[PDB]
Write a protein that binds this ligand. Sequence first.
Ligand SMILES: CNC(=O)[C@@H](NC(=O)c1ccc(-c2ccc(CSc3nc4c(c(=O)[nH]3)CCC4)cc2)o1)C(C)C
Ligand SMILES: [Ca+2]
Ligand SMILES: [Ca+2]
Ligand SMILES: [Ca+2]
Ligand SMILES: [Zn+2]
Ligand SMILES: [Zn+2]
Length: 160
Amino acid sequence: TLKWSKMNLTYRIVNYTPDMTHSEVEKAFKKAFKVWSDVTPLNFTRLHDGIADIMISFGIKEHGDFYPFDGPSGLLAHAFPPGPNYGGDAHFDDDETWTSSSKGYNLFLVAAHEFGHSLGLDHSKDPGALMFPIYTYTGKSHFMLPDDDVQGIQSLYGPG
Ligand SMILES: CNC(=O)[C@@H](NC(=O)c1ccc(-c2ccc(CSc3nc4c(c(=O)[nH]3)CCC4)cc2)o1)C(C)C
Ligand SMILES: [Ca+2]
Ligand SMILES: [Ca+2]
Ligand SMILES: [Ca+2]
Ligand SMILES: [Zn+2]
Ligand SMILES: [Zn+2]
């Protein structure tokens, strides 16, 4: 995997899970990209048409990359490293129930994690890291990006 050569990136929500309103989905993805722009010189801008650097969709079972999803629980989402077309993209398993809280899987947390992949991060060995492979909802009131994830993203793009 390689990093992005440019600091200004774009995304597009191609489709939307019915579990949340369009604007809850948009808020979640906005807050998730902010996780990373708040600690780098990166910037994210949403488009409503055209192909953006990061194309976001909701899928279930097989869905065109032939890395199928798998139903409730299990694989929750995945994403591709930096690069053209498919690179950057983020798919979310809509067989999960997506929520703004804990009534299912929290979309903001899974998106913040997947977008770390979109930017070149690997999974972490540190179980307290956002980039750790297993999802947890620790229910804290104010999200604070763990130090392991800060260092990994700043190792690629430096700080702000
Ligand atoms: C339920 N299934 C899984 O957890 C599987 N994982 C996935 O399919 C998958 C995709 C994306 C993620 C994921 C993993 C970890 C996190 C981080 S969750 C989290 N991180 C932090 C806090 C928190 O509360 N929750 C506070 C600081 C960082 C997000 C998505 O898991 C696992 C069995 C392989
Ligand atoms: Ca892309
Ligand atoms: Ca699943
Ligand atoms: Ca769903
Ligand atoms: Zn996919
Ligand atoms: Zn992951």
